[PDB]
Symmetry: D2
């Protein structure tokens, strides 16, 4: 191992599960939210899953405020929406509160893991479900029990080892379309993750083992745009067709940011209007949306509660956007 510089010890998942066990409150939040998203995916609930929050968590304090503001609207709009905080601990092409909690290249990953599990625990304990991005094959063991929904990143949707992981997660999973607008790799990923798999993974004890999964049927596509936005009713039509042709539920989640916002946080409100019109009009296929939002709109490379990663919408727009979606949902229902 000439290219390995150092090897340092890592707390087994059991260490963090023992220090920060799920309270009865937290367990209930996870259970109910998973259950509620399953009902939506099976078409037995006309409500809309709303996964919304910062692009990346970098300050537990700002994150807990956001969680309290969001919890309020979650309880206010629960008849129309299943609201889940985005708590993302990040894929790049050149990387998180877990991988470097002190954001200083000290890579205090054990501390990062402690900070992240506590935050997720605290959010779930309040009654707010959480959502995460699963990029690593080892980290999920420390956090998955506090996750009600997760996303496989667009750069890993085609990866066999991430489809294996998805096939064994206890929460539903979204797969993003290709960095070009194509759905095939995401349809393939849903089909793969739906099947059982046998593969090597690290256990709660931190040792490697052979695991066998059952397959995950709570997997769905996420429309994130390509060279052009793909949230319009024309694109929704195409995706639904490609899903029926593949034998999958004609369901989609629409990501209002990234390629779909044209890379302009403000445009997420445009996507919202468009999407609300489709739902208000009777589009039952849109079962969920994803929105990058924070306390303060904008970005930075530190202001309190403002993103250090992608640019997000602020709280006022967030409140607005969330009521629009809840109103679109009543129109589709009554």
């Amino acid at each position: 191992d000439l290219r390995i510089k150092e090897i340092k010890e890592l707390l087994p998942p059991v260490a963090l599960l023992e220090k920060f066990p799920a309270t009865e409150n937290a367990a209930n939040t996870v259970a109910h939210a998973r259950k509620a998203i399953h009902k939506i995916l099976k078409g037995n609930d006309d409500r809309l899953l709303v996964v919304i929050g910062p692009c990346s968590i970098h300050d537990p304090v700002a994150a807990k405020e956001y969680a309290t503001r969001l919890l309020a609207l979650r309880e206010e709009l629960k008849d129309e929406l299943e609201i889940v905080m985005r708590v993302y601990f990040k894929p790049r092409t050149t990387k998180g509160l877990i991988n470097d909690p002190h954001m200083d290249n000290s890579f205090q990953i054990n501390d990062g893991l402690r900070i992240a599990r506590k935050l997720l625990l605290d959010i779930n304990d309040s009654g707010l479900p959480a959502a995460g991005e699963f990029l690593d094959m080892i980290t999920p063991q420390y956090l998955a029990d506090l996750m009600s929904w997760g996303a496989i990143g667009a750069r890993t949707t085609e990866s066999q080892v991430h489809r294996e992981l998805a096939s064994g997660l206890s929460c539903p999973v979204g797969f993003k379309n290709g960095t070009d607008g194509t759905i095939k790799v995401a349809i393939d990923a849903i089909n793969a993750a739906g099947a059982p798999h046998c593969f090597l993974s690290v256990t709660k004890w931190g040792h490697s083992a052979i695991v066998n999964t059952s397959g995950n049927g709570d997997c769905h596509i996420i429309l994130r745009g390509g060279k052009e936005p793909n949230y319009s009713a024309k694109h929704v039509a195409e995706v639904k067709e490609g899903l029926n042709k593949a034998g999958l539920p004609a369901q989609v989640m629409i990501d209002f940011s990234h390629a779909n916002s044209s890379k302009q946080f403000k445009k997420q409100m445009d996507v919202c209007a468009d999407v609300c019109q489709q739902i208000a009009g009777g589009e039952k296929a849109i079962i969920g949306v994803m929105v990058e939002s924070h306390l303060v709109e904008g970005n930075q490379s530190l202001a309190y509660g403002k993103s250090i990663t992608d640019a997000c919408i602020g709280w006022e727009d967030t409140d607005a956007l969330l009521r629009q979606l809840a109103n679109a949902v009543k129109a589709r229902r009554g």
Copy 2:
């Protein structure tokens, strides 16, 4: 965990390394081939790296018979070619299917992975001890520790070139690594991968004791692109030119390995010979940037399916279709002739 049906004990890497230590000659094979490829990547040698052999290993008997034949050509053609055999134990599937010898050596969904690891490492050991270096695809995050000391070159497949955990893996590998262009032909994901892999990373991984740990890598500078086509093949001079400029633009060496198979053959195995003819004219006409090729070859041409029912023919691929030995011998001589012409 409720979608986790069962958990089973897994031999740690140390137990495989102790049971199957590298011989002196196997370690010499690995060290010499890695150095030789480094020299080609450095432009300090005009030979061509040839990664050639089965799509997937499913039969140690046929693999060793194939290795003997390839070794004889490796020795005959070594002034021109650095021949490394494809010993691929891990297959990425488009959706589902047999994932290779390690995941399921009995090819019947018994998933006897401890046996698969023993079988795989013994075969790699035997092949290297004979003097033939080996190449593999690094797909799984945990299997590399069982095998990497016997690998002279590795590939990251097109479906994982964008994957951060695969780029992290390459930054700590002791062998040179090729990154495939994207399944749609995109070159940029591979240039980014090479740059990512050239840098040090700190990430979670598993040690030779089978325990997760925090690891720090130094970056791997022996990485390069593999052209494997997109919607259309991308082996022709026009494409090699675009890729050279893209690489230089990003501050990387302007050099490529060309996969004759997969989308560059439109998945028609005999078309590898057409790619070969075009690439040999490129090399013989003076193209120095083509430092390597990849070819899917076996003893018997074509392929067969485990789902057919028909008994398995010996020495015939059960994954992608491959050229047979006769075409393989003729292809290798074509490449060696072209490298010689490029030189004179």
Copy 3:
């Protein structure tokens, strides 16, 4: 194999350390007690180390009441005694028997060892957090990692003073250690033990991650003998002088700790009061070699057998009750101020 019926999962030390980390107070209590005991063993403190408490812990409830009472006397008699509570979570049996709180916290042969570990470390942590140092017997080769950071002093049982693995264990322990004389009163075994424990060793052990490893220790100087009688008691100033002679002959400090129980009490808890008088007579009369004493004390004197159990009474060896305990500590604190 044939005589192994089942194997079950065991939390690694790092899981106990993370859930139940030392508070600053706990870290203080342990640090100072260790320093304090060190100063006594280097003969720079005239005080007496007193290792007193239940024979075994079986009830964090009764154990917590005791710790409050003892802590009061530790703070009052602190100028003469260094009080350290017995918190024994594991017990060596003569043949078989309940092995202590860790091995079987529910005293019913259910061997919920993971709960035992949790229960034991939370208690140890609270006792320390309150300011009361703690002592234990290090019997198991694997449990020490879960508890030793909360131990101010440790003991190697008489039936293991001669054990290589235990002598090795003592040489890497962060706390002072005492070796009980042989069960038949033999003093040599413990002198040898002290000497080994003081040297470095290289041996196999289990790390804080639950993994076996090769360990090198530095050797432990802060080790001493513990007199606990043999075929008859051996606490009398005659025996003490003989021991101080072997210790000198052997090159070691002529220092001793006296256990008023086990063989020195003929297994009769009340005779611990008798031994207290004899040793106080030696200490008031000038004996500067008695650096410590061990006493089996509990809330309610006597002992009971193992369904509902009587509060405050030992399920292992018989102990003196709290009444006798408070007088005993005042007897010792009186003998010390005399020597000074």
Copy 4:
């Protein structure tokens, strides 16, 4: 941990079991030998168990030559003697000296314990594969995992016969276990240890994977005392009588193994033949409680201090040499024949 200087990786047992797997020959040797000692310990065989071999192993080559010679005798005398080779790797020592083959295979204080474990297991494997059963000493709780599958009989250190942890270990051992009498000669501890060891236990151990776990044992019924002397030898008929007596009271089979060396020979290797003569008298006279003997034997008698060393000569305690060993074994066989008819 402030008195902990360093921590180094240790190969897990599975790593050595994979590298050096029991052959079929080796497995049968262990199984058959373990079965034959059970029968002897159940009064169902009248043959004598003979654990004999070097005080400790420092040279696998000499050890293999010794094993070859003993194997021949083992076959020649099989109707009378169940001959098991002593394969011990260390001399437990209260003062410093060579730490044995596993601890320090290279005899230079380099503590190449990984090297030692490999050497030690490969030796036990080779010996068992040849057909010769092996006996070992269990001194710690971790090394047995790497070796016990090739052990047909085991002994607990005399300094740890009273230790609960070693009694727990014996309760899970797959081989019969001998327990040594106290150093002053008393048998109470070996009786307590037999009782303790015959009971099921639950305790923490390291597994084949090198991880700690909770284990439960069934208890070991094939345990017995080893007479190794006190202040005075304790092999004579008078002493056997006392021990048979105390065993019958404590509810245990009145049977013993007699260690001819150490205190029973006044630390004089040649006097193992004096003990042999006496024991052979007792046995040929009908004594049936003597189910076994332990002898320290090597190719070349005596010992040497650890530059080239003498081949086949102990570097720990002094042993009888091969000529005395062959004669001792024939003495034992001949007595066994007299006790029966």
